Write a protein that binds this ligand. Sequence first.
Ligand SMILES: [Cl-]
Ligand SMILES: [Cl-]
Ligand SMILES: [Cl-]
Ligand SMILES: [Cl-]
Ligand SMILES: [Cl-]
Ligand SMILES: [Cl-]
Ligand SMILES: [Cl-]
Ligand SMILES: [Cl-]
Ligand SMILES: [Cl-]
Ligand SMILES: [Cl-]
Ligand SMILES: [Mg+2]
Ligand SMILES: [Mg+2]
Lengths: 312, 313, 313
Amino acid sequence: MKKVSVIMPTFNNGEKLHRTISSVLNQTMKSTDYELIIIDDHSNDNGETLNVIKKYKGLVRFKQLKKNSGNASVPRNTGLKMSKAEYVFFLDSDDLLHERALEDLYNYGKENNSDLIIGKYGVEGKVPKAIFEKGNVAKADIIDNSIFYALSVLKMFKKSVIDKNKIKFKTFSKTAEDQLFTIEFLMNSKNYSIKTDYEYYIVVNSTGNQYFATINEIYKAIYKSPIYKNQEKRHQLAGKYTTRLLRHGQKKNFANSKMKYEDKIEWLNNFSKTINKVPRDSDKYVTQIFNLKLEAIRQNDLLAVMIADKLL
Amino acid sequence: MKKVSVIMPTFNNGEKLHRTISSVLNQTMKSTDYELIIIDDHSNDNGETLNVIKKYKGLVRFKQLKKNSGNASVPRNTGLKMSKAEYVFFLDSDDLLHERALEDLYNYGKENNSDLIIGKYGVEGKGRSVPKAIFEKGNVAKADIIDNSIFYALSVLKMFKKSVIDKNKIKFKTFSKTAEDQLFTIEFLMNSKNYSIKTDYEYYIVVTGNQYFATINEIYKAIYKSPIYKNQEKRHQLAGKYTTRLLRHGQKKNFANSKMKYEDKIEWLNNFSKTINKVPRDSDKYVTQIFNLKLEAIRQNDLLAVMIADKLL
Amino acid sequence: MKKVSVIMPTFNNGEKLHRTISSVLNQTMKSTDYELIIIDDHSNDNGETLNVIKKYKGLVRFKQLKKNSGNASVPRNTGLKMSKAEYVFFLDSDDLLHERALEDLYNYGKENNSDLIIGKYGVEGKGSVPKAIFEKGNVAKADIIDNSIFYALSVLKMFKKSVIDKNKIKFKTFSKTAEDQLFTIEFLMNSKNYSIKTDYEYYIVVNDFNQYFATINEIYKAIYKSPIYKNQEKRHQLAGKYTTRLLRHGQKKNFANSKMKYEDKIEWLNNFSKTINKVPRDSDKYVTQIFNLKLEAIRQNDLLAVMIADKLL
Ligand SMILES: [Cl-]
Ligand SMILES: [Cl-]
Ligand SMILES: [Cl-]
Ligand SMILES: [Cl-]
Ligand SMILES: [Cl-]
Ligand SMILES: [Cl-]
Ligand SMILES: [Cl-]
Ligand SMILES: [Cl-]
Ligand SMILES: [Cl-]
Ligand SMILES: [Cl-]
Ligand SMILES: [Mg+2]
Ligand SMILES: [Mg+2]
């Protein structure tokens, strides 16, 4: 059993993919203990991506899907089925791992019996920060360590948790599926760790029917948590997630935007129906400045949302 | 016939009463000219309150009700029936009278043929009078509800002419605990016209919404049926000035953005809205303009608009 | 065939009218090339306006309406029926022409094949005229949006008469205001060539001592049926730029927080709402962004939101 499967979907990456693959093959961890699983989502760049990948034959595992899925969910699920490692780590094909990433995160996880290890993110070009503000955290808390503000899957996940709970990337929506994966993982596991000694992971830079179906699933995951079983704790998590959704949600400022009227109505209708399945008991945990915006959304009142945004 | 009846309801006050009763017996007014009437609302403090009252036998009048009524209304109504004086003055069981209070207010009322005399007063602790506009112009022989800010001083710590109460059958209501005192003063004001304000001393020292809005509804009814203020536009002006006072000082005035449960907010606003919508809109132009949005939002029964109105205030 | 008919309605103008008539008779244009048509709206100032007009008999054409109509629309239409000239120019009886107005405007118009010629306005005494239309100097081929014509829609302009005749353009009596705006819009929507001349103050406005939305509706209808501006996106652009003009300078633009009676105010909003809701939402992208909330609030027919929108501007 390997310590870590790095799962990396590709699509039309081309020559830039050398630096990514190279960052993974040059880990401090012994290559006996990890594998890179590359799942190409049927690239169509006259062979250029597949040609880069072929230079690493024998050093990687590779699968190409027959038809392009059009998002990382199907390739990520494929990678999950192929991995038999203790932990998985999702890498986006533009990005880079620090040479110490797999070894440092695995070791910290092993030491602290971690279900999830989050490595500090860096950037190339012009990522969450609050989660990393306290340095290393051996046993982090969702609310105190701002985990709802860092829900990417660019993290080290314990595979047994995924297997036992049959956690998979959903395909019904094109967006927020990663967030849902991470939420379902958090709600079905206990021990999360945050590791900060280096920048371990370097990021290289709709009507809402699908998106709000996915948000609906996030709230469902919280309220059915077998880890957080207390109803008041579920209200608290749900309320803190609402706060995050209002601060950083997709199209958060739709109301006063240049969106067509009928689109704004359909968006808000979806947002309203979703939030009205969330108990009002969660509302007291939402930050006070958002009181009017949240109520506007509950009432499905576009003018009130517009006004709420003007006053924020 | 006595000049003044002081009417004081009691319930479970015990030894605290001593200070109050002493302050009433130590008046400059000749003791033959006034009476303290104590009405006990069936205290159940192991005889402590009634024991205190009985140590003043022969110096006060009293009666204990058979059942506890719940608020000051039925005891005060009972004091009203027992009084044959020319003026009544309501004093609560923890209040203090200045020694010159009855004489100074009575004499000023008598000089000015007053239906109502209002003395300057303050609150325990403060050592000074309340900062109300009503007392900021000094002695006023013939006051005006609007010019002398009387809607901001609707307590029943006033000296009221008894014939006004008897002829118009004015009684305290048991609709709600809150605002029963306001309603009585409003009914009295709408049935009289000679109001005096005396300010030489701190004359006394004081300590769903379905029922509350029922009381507010009776206030507007009192104004719009006034047999003194009969002109329709004057009624609109009085109603509008009362609306202003309600928005400035009413109960749970900032409920909309408060931590109250949503269901409670809706219930509260619905009662408020049903009540205000019985008030003619002709009154609204007399409300201070900063409240124009909040008032319309209440008439429209629109919680989001009240929330917004409050954020802009 | 005259070059120009000046059409001037009168009513109880009296002695003042000498100076206006004199300004028309004193033109650089040859006197035989133009005519002044005076239509008196049955003045009743004891023969005085008539007496002034009669002093110019033989130098003007004159018709007295047999009963007063109370507006400039019926006299102006009367004037149009009487004119057989190439161009007409409407003159208000308070106002004055520069001696070079008819010649300079007509010559510019001829040079540039103009349907409409607009000369710079001056103003006498406090009580202003549009400016933006005149801040690009002399414009041979002007554009409604780029030359701010929506901000200068009076009929104190030179209009080619064939355009009016073949399209049967007439002044309406829907409203007290904006009937001149509707006339100019209907003309603009039936013509392509407009000119602006700014070398002099050609026209001096002298400051001496009821279905508005029916009119606004007819303005949007004229845009959306224009045989000149046939492209649907262009119509949307014109409609949005007009909407912007309406929100910046319209009648009672701040009605929502005004002291208008509720019944009048709610009528105003509803008539505004139902008028704008006949205008495609495609036009709203051409409205200045600051008005986004106010415009949507009107479309939604929501008085509270319009009140709030005005408070935020
Ligand atoms: Cl949080
Ligand atoms: Cl976030
Ligand atoms: Cl993240
Ligand atoms: Cl638990
Ligand atoms: Cl989101
Ligand atoms: Cl007042
Ligand atoms: Cl008071
Ligand atoms: Cl109540
Ligand atoms: Cl244009
Ligand atoms: Cl103009
Ligand atoms: Mg609203
Ligand atoms: Mg001449």
